[PDB]
């Protein structure tokens, strides 16, 4: 039966690709100093 | 088999969590697993806990107690999934996050 049928799987063609979010840029300052009234 | 509770993942490189005592809440162990597997805080809430031997999932505020005798195996899995998240399926609209004034 299947001996006479040969065909590549249909889930092997690729198109338009894809893209996720990579990451977030780390950034933060610190410049506190404190006094009382 | 051996006495004790074990967390399990799907990556052989990450060693399983191991604990002998302590009185925990599911969110703490969840964000512990997240820290160990290095998941962004923007994405940790997609994950939860599940018991294969019970076919049930623990509550976010559920309390788990050890008594030097208890033992069970747990699975830190992602649960909330949305179909056609990708853009490969052109037959239906995909999904995306909102962006401040392309799609994220």
Curated annotation (Swiss-Prot), chain A:
Ubiquitinated by FBXO45-containing E3 ligase leading to proteasomal degradation. Disruption phenotype: The mice are viable and appear to be of normal size, behavior and reproductive ability. There is no effect on the ability to combat vaginal viral infection, but antiviral response evoked by Toll-like receptor (TLR) stimulation is reduced. Mice also display enhanced rotavirus susceptibility associated with epithelial vacuolization, villus deformation and epithelial cell disruption. It is found in: Membrane. Belongs to the type II cytokine receptor family. The IFNLR1/IL10RB dimer is a receptor for the cytokine ligands IFNL2 and IFNL3 and mediates their antiviral activity. The ligand/receptor complex stimulate the activation of the JAK/STAT signaling pathway leading to the expression of IFN-stimulated genes (ISG), which contribute to the antiviral state. Determines the cell type specificity of the lambda interferon action. Shows a more restricted pattern of expression in the epithelial tissues thereby limiting responses to lambda interferons primarily to epithelial cells of the respiratory, gastrointestinal, and reproductive tracts. Heterodimer with IL10RB. This is Interferon lambda receptor 1. The chain holds residues 255 to 291 of 535 of the full protein.
